[PDB]
Design an enzyme around this catalytic site. Structure first.
Site, PDB file in Angstrom:
ATOM      1  N   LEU A  12       0.811  -1.220   0.000  1.00  0.00           N
ATOM      2  CA  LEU A  12       0.000   0.000   0.000  1.00  0.00           C
ATOM      3  C   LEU A  12       0.842   1.267   0.000  1.00  0.00           C
ATOM      4  O   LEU A  12       0.455   2.278  -0.591  1.00  0.00           O
ATOM      5  CB  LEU A  12      -0.950   0.026   1.199  1.00  0.00           C
ATOM      6  CG  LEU A  12      -2.179  -0.876   1.178  1.00  0.00           C
ATOM      7  CD1 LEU A  12      -2.864  -0.837   2.534  1.00  0.00           C
ATOM      8  CD2 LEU A  12      -3.152  -0.496   0.052  1.00  0.00           C
ATOM      9  N   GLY A  13       1.988   1.212   0.667  1.00  0.00           N
ATOM     10  CA  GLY A  13       2.895   2.348   0.741  1.00  0.00           C
ATOM     11  C   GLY A  13       4.095   2.032   1.606  1.00  0.00           C
ATOM     12  O   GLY A  13       4.157   0.969   2.228  1.00  0.00           O
ATOM     13  N   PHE A  16       6.834   4.630   7.919  1.00  0.00           N
ATOM     14  CA  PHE A  16       8.024   5.263   8.487  1.00  0.00           C
ATOM     15  C   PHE A  16       9.105   4.257   8.890  1.00  0.00           C
ATOM     16  O   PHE A  16      10.302   4.559   8.837  1.00  0.00           O
ATOM     17  CB  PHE A  16       7.659   6.142   9.684  1.00  0.00           C
ATOM     18  CG  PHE A  16       8.795   6.990  10.179  1.00  0.00           C
ATOM     19  CD1 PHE A  16       9.194   8.129   9.474  1.00  0.00           C
ATOM     20  CD2 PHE A  16       9.475   6.651  11.344  1.00  0.00           C
ATOM     21  CE1 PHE A  16      10.251   8.917   9.933  1.00  0.00           C
ATOM     22  CE2 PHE A  16      10.524   7.431  11.811  1.00  0.00           C
ATOM     23  CZ  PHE A  16      10.916   8.565  11.103  1.00  0.00           C
ATOM     24  N   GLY A  18       8.825   0.824   7.792  1.00  0.00           N
ATOM     25  CA  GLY A  18       8.759  -0.282   6.834  1.00  0.00           C
ATOM     26  C   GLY A  18       7.504  -0.207   5.990  1.00  0.00           C
ATOM     27  O   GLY A  18       6.661   0.671   6.209  1.00  0.00           O
ATOM     28  N   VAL A  20       3.861  -0.871   4.252  1.00  0.00           N
ATOM     29  CA  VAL A  20       2.513  -1.164   4.688  1.00  0.00           C
ATOM     30  C   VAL A  20       1.874  -2.004   3.589  1.00  0.00           C
ATOM     31  O   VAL A  20       1.868  -1.616   2.423  1.00  0.00           O
ATOM     32  CB  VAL A  20       1.689   0.128   4.917  1.00  0.00           C
ATOM     33  CG1 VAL A  20       0.272  -0.204   5.373  1.00  0.00           C
ATOM     34  CG2 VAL A  20       2.376   1.013   5.944  1.00  0.00           C
ATOM     35  N   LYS A  38       1.172  -3.086   9.013  1.00  0.00           N
ATOM     36  CA  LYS A  38       2.393  -2.299   9.129  1.00  0.00           C
ATOM     37  C   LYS A  38       3.560  -3.170   9.559  1.00  0.00           C
ATOM     38  O   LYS A  38       3.422  -4.005  10.446  1.00  0.00           O
ATOM     39  CB  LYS A  38       2.207  -1.151  10.118  1.00  0.00           C
ATOM     40  CG  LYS A  38       1.100  -0.176   9.677  1.00  0.00           C
ATOM     41  CD  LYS A  38       1.026   1.037  10.574  1.00  0.00           C
ATOM     42  CE  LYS A  38       2.203   1.975  10.330  1.00  0.00           C
ATOM     43  NZ  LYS A  38       1.972   3.308  10.954  1.00  0.00           N
ATOM     44  N   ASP A 130      -2.845  16.579  11.442  1.00  0.00           N
ATOM     45  CA  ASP A 130      -2.932  16.245  10.023  1.00  0.00           C
ATOM     46  C   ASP A 130      -4.346  15.868   9.591  1.00  0.00           C
ATOM     47  O   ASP A 130      -4.546  14.910   8.855  1.00  0.00           O
ATOM     48  CB  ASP A 130      -1.928  15.118   9.697  1.00  0.00           C
ATOM     49  CG  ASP A 130      -1.617  15.004   8.228  1.00  0.00           C
ATOM     50  OD1 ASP A 130      -1.881  15.956   7.459  1.00  0.00           O
ATOM     51  OD2 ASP A 130      -1.118  13.926   7.837  1.00  0.00           O
ATOM     52  N   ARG A 134      -7.663  12.687   3.214  1.00  0.00           N
ATOM     53  CA  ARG A 134      -6.712  11.585   2.933  1.00  0.00           C
ATOM     54  C   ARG A 134      -6.482  10.704   4.180  1.00  0.00           C
ATOM     55  O   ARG A 134      -6.022   9.560   4.068  1.00  0.00           O
ATOM     56  CB  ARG A 134      -5.364  12.116   2.417  1.00  0.00           C
ATOM     57  CG  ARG A 134      -4.591  12.976   3.423  1.00  0.00           C
ATOM     58  CD  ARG A 134      -3.222  13.460   2.899  1.00  0.00           C
ATOM     59  NE  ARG A 134      -2.712  14.535   3.758  1.00  0.00           N
ATOM     60  CZ  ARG A 134      -3.097  15.803   3.644  1.00  0.00           C
ATOM     61  NH1 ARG A 134      -3.981  16.133   2.722  1.00  0.00           N
ATOM     62  NH2 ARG A 134      -2.621  16.733   4.454  1.00  0.00           N
ATOM     63  N   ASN A 135      -6.806  11.243   5.357  1.00  0.00           N
ATOM     64  CA  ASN A 135      -6.660  10.497   6.618  1.00  0.00           C
ATOM     65  C   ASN A 135      -7.978   9.918   7.144  1.00  0.00           C
ATOM     66  O   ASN A 135      -8.094   9.577   8.317  1.00  0.00           O
ATOM     67  CB  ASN A 135      -5.964  11.376   7.680  1.00  0.00           C
ATOM     68  CG  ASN A 135      -4.464  11.434   7.484  1.00  0.00           C
ATOM     69  OD1 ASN A 135      -3.816  12.488   7.655  1.00  0.00           O
ATOM     70  ND2 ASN A 135      -3.893  10.299   7.121  1.00  0.00           N
ATOM     71  N   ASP A 148      -4.634   8.260  11.059  1.00  0.00           N
ATOM     72  CA  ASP A 148      -3.417   9.052  10.850  1.00  0.00           C
ATOM     73  C   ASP A 148      -2.438   8.179  10.061  1.00  0.00           C
ATOM     74  O   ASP A 148      -1.693   7.380  10.630  1.00  0.00           O
ATOM     75  CB  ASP A 148      -2.833   9.590  12.173  1.00  0.00           C
ATOM     76  CG  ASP A 148      -1.582  10.437  11.959  1.00  0.00           C
ATOM     77  OD1 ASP A 148      -1.169  10.582  10.796  1.00  0.00           O
ATOM     78  OD2 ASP A 148      -0.996  10.926  12.953  1.00  0.00           O
TER      79      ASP A 148
HETATM   80  C1  LIG Z   1       2.693   5.940  17.081  1.00  0.00           C
HETATM   81  C2  LIG Z   1       1.291   6.202  16.581  1.00  0.00           C
HETATM   82  C3  LIG Z   1       0.253   6.295  17.498  1.00  0.00           C
HETATM   83  C4  LIG Z   1      -1.045   6.530  17.047  1.00  0.00           C
HETATM   84  C5  LIG Z   1      -1.359   6.656  15.686  1.00  0.00           C
HETATM   85  N1  LIG Z   1      -2.604   6.945  15.266  1.00  0.00           N
HETATM   86  N2  LIG Z   1      -3.321   7.896  15.984  1.00  0.00           N
HETATM   87  C6  LIG Z   1      -4.467   7.956  15.267  1.00  0.00           C
HETATM   88  C7  LIG Z   1      -5.545   8.891  15.758  1.00  0.00           C
HETATM   89  C8  LIG Z   1      -4.926  10.269  16.041  1.00  0.00           C
HETATM   90  C9  LIG Z   1      -6.670   8.982  14.740  1.00  0.00           C
HETATM   91  C10 LIG Z   1      -6.136   8.330  17.039  1.00  0.00           C
HETATM   92  C11 LIG Z   1      -4.522   7.118  14.134  1.00  0.00           C
HETATM   93  C12 LIG Z   1      -3.261   6.517  14.183  1.00  0.00           C
HETATM   94  N3  LIG Z   1      -2.747   5.559  13.327  1.00  0.00           N
HETATM   95  C13 LIG Z   1      -3.284   5.063  12.215  1.00  0.00           C
HETATM   96  O1  LIG Z   1      -4.389   5.400  11.795  1.00  0.00           O
HETATM   97  N4  LIG Z   1      -2.544   4.121  11.599  1.00  0.00           N
HETATM   98  C14 LIG Z   1      -2.856   3.570  10.357  1.00  0.00           C
HETATM   99  C15 LIG Z   1      -1.804   3.858   9.486  1.00  0.00           C
HETATM  100  C16 LIG Z   1      -1.828   3.498   8.144  1.00  0.00           C
HETATM  101  C17 LIG Z   1      -2.941   2.848   7.640  1.00  0.00           C
HETATM  102  O2  LIG Z   1      -2.956   2.489   6.312  1.00  0.00           O
HETATM  103  C18 LIG Z   1      -2.088   3.116   5.352  1.00  0.00           C
HETATM  104  C19 LIG Z   1      -2.506   2.711   3.936  1.00  0.00           C
HETATM  105  N5  LIG Z   1      -3.556   3.603   3.424  1.00  0.00           N
HETATM  106  C20 LIG Z   1      -4.785   3.525   4.251  1.00  0.00           C
HETATM  107  C21 LIG Z   1      -5.885   4.372   3.615  1.00  0.00           C
HETATM  108  O3  LIG Z   1      -6.147   3.864   2.304  1.00  0.00           O
HETATM  109  C22 LIG Z   1      -5.017   3.995   1.432  1.00  0.00           C
HETATM  110  C23 LIG Z   1      -3.823   3.233   2.008  1.00  0.00           C
HETATM  111  C24 LIG Z   1      -4.032   2.578   8.493  1.00  0.00           C
HETATM  112  C25 LIG Z   1      -5.152   1.930   7.972  1.00  0.00           C
HETATM  113  C26 LIG Z   1      -6.240   1.652   8.794  1.00  0.00           C
HETATM  114  C27 LIG Z   1      -6.218   2.021  10.130  1.00  0.00           C
HETATM  115  C28 LIG Z   1      -5.106   2.665  10.661  1.00  0.00           C
HETATM  116  C29 LIG Z   1      -4.012   2.948   9.853  1.00  0.00           C
HETATM  117  C30 LIG Z   1      -0.277   6.599  14.795  1.00  0.00           C
HETATM  118  C31 LIG Z   1       1.035   6.350  15.223  1.00  0.00           C
END
Ligand SMILES: Cc1ccc(-n2nc(C(C)(C)C)cc2NC(=O)Nc2ccc(OCCN3CCOCC3)c3ccccc23)cc1
Length: 254
Positions: A12-13, A16, A18, A20, A38, A130, A134-135, A148
């Site tokens: 998928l991408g 940071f 490694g 996904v 991840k 952020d 996109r999030n 995120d």
């Molecule tokens: C250390 C740390 C702690 C907490 C977080 N953190 N905090 C939040 C809040 C603020 C909303 C609560 C959210 C997150 N982390 C994430 O949301 N991490 C995620 C990363 C990448 C993803 O997928 C990427 C691929 N992408 C997904 C969307 O469709 C296109 C492909 C994800 C896909 C589905 C669900 C979660 C994903 C992050 C890091």
């Protein structure tokens, strides 16, 4: 969760720590759940491994209806963090494909749902930094979830651009930019500017124009979120009330 229960499909991408991967997790009931997996480069420092892991430790605690969901962690090398995905993808791209059929009420609904997620984060003094379409994932036509996944100059508050200050009040600014995206069916804010030109425009009092389909009352709320002075922006907690009002007004009109 057993590793044999997770089948990876494609990259998928590059995260940071490694890559996904997209995958399918087959739970004990035999039902197939789309997942993002991840990974962490093996040769990382102990501190970076700990940071990688911390996402799992943290996200295990989140159970909000409009925040993304952790499915599980496989701690054994190679350590995998397994997050829930849904059929519909990012909201940005969903809006783009469904622009001819989505009603304003639904756009206000998505805005309100993300606002509720943020009111929860605000309650524990946590800052997103952020907030953008996109999030955001589409869990169903009736439900979006904030994540995120990954500077976003065109979304940022003046204090974030100028001083790299990020507070809940700067999140409120970004959230209103996210609302603008939603009501614009996924258009990018300030697509007509280069990043470098943005602060000059904001400093002079210019703002994103009202999206065609955006109710005037909702645009007024956006503008309050875009007050230069962070103290004049509403809290997310109160913005939920204001957005709920707009939703009910739009529902009645419908
Ligand atoms: C250390 C740390 C702690 C907490 C977080 N953190 N905090 C939040 C809040 C603020 C909303 C609560 C959210 C997150 N982390 C994430 O949301 N991490 C995620 C990363 C990448 C993803 O997928 C990427 C691929 N992408 C997904 C969307 O469709 C296109 C492909 C994800 C896909 C589905 C669900 C979660 C994903 C992050 C890091």
């Amino acid at each position: 969760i057993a590793r044999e229960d997770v089948v990876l499909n494609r990259i998928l991408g590059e995260g940071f720590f490694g890559e996904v991967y997209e995958g399918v997790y087959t739970n004990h009931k035999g039902e197939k759940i789309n997942v993002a997996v991840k990974t962490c480069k093996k040769d990382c420092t102990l501190d970076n491994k700990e940071k990688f892991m911390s996402e799992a430790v943290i996200m295990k605690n989140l159970d909000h209806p409009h925040i993304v969901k952790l499915i599980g962690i496989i701690e054994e090398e190679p350590t995998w963090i397994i997050m829930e995905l849904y059929p519909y993808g990012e909201l940005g791209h969903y809006l783009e494909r469904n622009k001819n059929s989505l009603k304003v009420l639904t756009l206000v609904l998505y805005s309100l749902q993300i606002c509720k997620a943020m009111a929860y984060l605000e309650s524990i003094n946590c800052v997103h930094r952020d907030i953008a379409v996109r999030n955001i994932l589409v869990a169903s036509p009736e439900c979006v979830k904030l994540g995120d996944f990954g500077l976003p100059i065109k979304w940022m508050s003046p204090e974030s651009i100028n001083f790299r200050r990020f507070t809940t009040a700067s999140d409120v600014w970004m959230f209103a930019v996210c609302m603008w995206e939603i009501l614009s069916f996924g258009k990018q804010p300030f697509f007509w500017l280069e990043n470098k030109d943005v602060i000059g425009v904001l400093e002079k009092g210019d703002r994103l124009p009202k999206p065609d389909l955006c109710p005037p009352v909702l645009y007024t709320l956006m503008t309050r979120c875009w007050d230069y002075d962070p103290s004049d922006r509403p809290r997310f907690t109160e913005l939920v009330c204001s957005l709920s009002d707009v939703y009910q007004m739009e529902k009645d009109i419908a």
